[PDB]
RNA sequence: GCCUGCCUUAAGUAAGUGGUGUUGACGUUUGGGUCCUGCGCAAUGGGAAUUCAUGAACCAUGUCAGGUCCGGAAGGAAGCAGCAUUAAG
């Protein structure tokens, strides 16, 4: 949904060039080249990510005009493409599950990233996504309201949050938790484990304890995106002093750049499994690195009762499938079209549910009075029921059309 | 010119056949209608005033899905299928 906006805009105005021209030069490639290299580094992408990122498209966009003459810039935006989905790792890396219930999950980072947070959110999508059963855990013991703000976030999930307290060691925790998970049958258990501002020695000590007694079969690091290079440095750190299997990038809300989401592969070898996309519960989605960089390149891939129907699919059942998100993603790259209904859906919604059955069934039926007082019960005089018609009757030649 | 025809014109006189009344307004006239035609009517039939179940988008029906507005809040609110829902079938 979210995201890498900047960067997209200073990008799509020098993809506009080459597109347009089906022509490949040896300037024009270096020209676009130069223009894309400005970008990646303004986006605080890693310096080396972008020297190596630069030319390897650069040497397959010169070979491409000799590779094909059909389509030649649209070529061009394919070669880039498929290198930035490359480098956002390859293809969606998805949540291991253990041989023997229950997957451990260990989440790490430093104070402010989004543990406490994304651990709920994880949670959430385990049970509504793969229908999970998982169990979240207190191990942070150093802050106080860390305890009770897992505990709140367990409460709006229905979810089991496991404590001792503030006065035992986060190792008994865990060891704990996960016994208790073994005897009541939860599909996972997923550590919130503690962190200062910056790593210490105190902190590295603490981890691999957990790690040891827990042997988790996942290790998320939780880091805030917007953070550019120093989420990638975080990354390296803790990949070394503990074993990174993931990482979950969180506010990529208020992330215009991408930095850090372009950098970490290259740099750590840890794939992205998740993105945190606001403050809510169920702003987790999965990193889908082609779909992200189609985003970064504006790239995309009964009259009354088929009206409710599509009231009801469009307004609130949202939610399309067989790649309908992602020709979909953006408004479809906008159509050309700036306008969205809104309360304007709301007003047509309100007009609709104005009439009777009958009239339901048979729109023609309604005479001038007789949806005059259907006006009068929406709030539109005649101007909201005679765009709703005419849109009616332009549906029906279109169905006409199609069959 | 009835010598034959005035038989159709002022009674009949009589053999043949089923009956029948006139002094009696009699009675052995046994069995049928005894107003057929207009006035005020009552067996009897045809459609009834009124009885029990169901029924108006606006358009008469109390809040009688909701959305807009007045309002940080609430109520008025297609009272749309359901409710009393009538006379209208
Ligand atoms: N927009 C957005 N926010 C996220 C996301 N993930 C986590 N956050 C926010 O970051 C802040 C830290 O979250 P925690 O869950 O406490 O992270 P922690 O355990 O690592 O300390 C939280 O709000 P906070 O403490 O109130 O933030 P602030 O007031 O310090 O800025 C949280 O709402 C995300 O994906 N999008």
Redesign the pocket.
């Known amino acids: 949904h979210m995201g890498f906006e900047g960067l997209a805009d200073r990008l799509q105005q020098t993809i506009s060039k080459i597109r347009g021209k089906g022509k490949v030069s040896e300037q024009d490639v270096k020209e676009m080249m130069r223009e894309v290299r400005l970008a990646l580094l303004e986006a605080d992408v890693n310096f080396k990510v972008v020297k190596d990122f630069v030319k390897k498209v650069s040497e397959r966009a010169v070979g491409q005009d000799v590779m094909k003459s059909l389509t030649p810039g649209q070529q061009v935006i394919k070669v880039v493409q498929e290198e930035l989905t490359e480098l956002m790792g390859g293809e969606e890396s998805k949540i291991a599950v253990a041989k023997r219930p229950p997957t451990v999950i260990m989440m790490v980072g430093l104070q402010g990233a989004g543990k406490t947070t994304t651990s709920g959110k994880l949670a959430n999508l385990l049970r509504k996504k793969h229908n999970r059963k998982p169990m979240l855990v207190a191990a942070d013991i150093y802050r106080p309201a860390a305890i009770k703000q897992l505990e709140t976030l367990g409460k709006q999930l229905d979810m089991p949050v496991f404590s001792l307290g503030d006065q035992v060691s986060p190792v008994e925790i865990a060891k704990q938790a996960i016994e208790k998970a073994k005897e009541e049958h939860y599909d996972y258990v997923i550590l919130d484990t503690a962190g200062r501002l910056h790593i210490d020695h105190e902190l590295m000590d603490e981890l691999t304890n957990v790690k040891e007694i827990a042997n988790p079969e996942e290790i998320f690091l939780v880091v805030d995106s917007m953070t550019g290079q120093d989420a990638v440095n975080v990354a390296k750190s803790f990949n070394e002093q503990l074993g990174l299997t993931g990482v979950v990038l969180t506010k990529l809300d208020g992330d215009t750049r991408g930095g850090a989401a372009l950098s970490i592969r290259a740099v750590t070898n840890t794939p992205i499994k998740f993105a945190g996309l606001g403050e809510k519960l169920d702003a987790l989605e999965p990193f889908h690195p082609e779909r992200m960089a189609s985003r970064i390149l504006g790239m995309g891939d009964t009259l009354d009762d088929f009206l409710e129907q599509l009231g009801q699919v469009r307004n609130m059942g949202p939610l399309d499938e067989l790649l309908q998100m992602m020709p979909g993603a953006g408004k479809m790259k906008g159509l050309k079209n700036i306008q969205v209904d809104e309360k304007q859906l709301?007003?047509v919604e309100?007009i609709i549910?104005?009439?009777?059955?009958?009239?339901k069934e048979q729109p023609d039926?309604?005479?001038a009075?007789?949806?005059?007082?259907?006006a009068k019960?929406?709030?539109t005089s005649v101007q909201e029921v005679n765009r709703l018609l005419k849109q009616f009757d332009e549906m029906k030649k279109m169905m006409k059309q199609m069959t």
Not at 353 to 359: D, G, Q, R
Not at 369 to 374: A, F, L, N, Q, T
Request: hydrophobic residues 30%; positive net charge; without cysteine.
């Open positions: 709301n007003h309100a549910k104005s009439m009777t059955v009958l009239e039926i309604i005479n009075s007789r949806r005059k007082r259907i019960g929406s709030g």
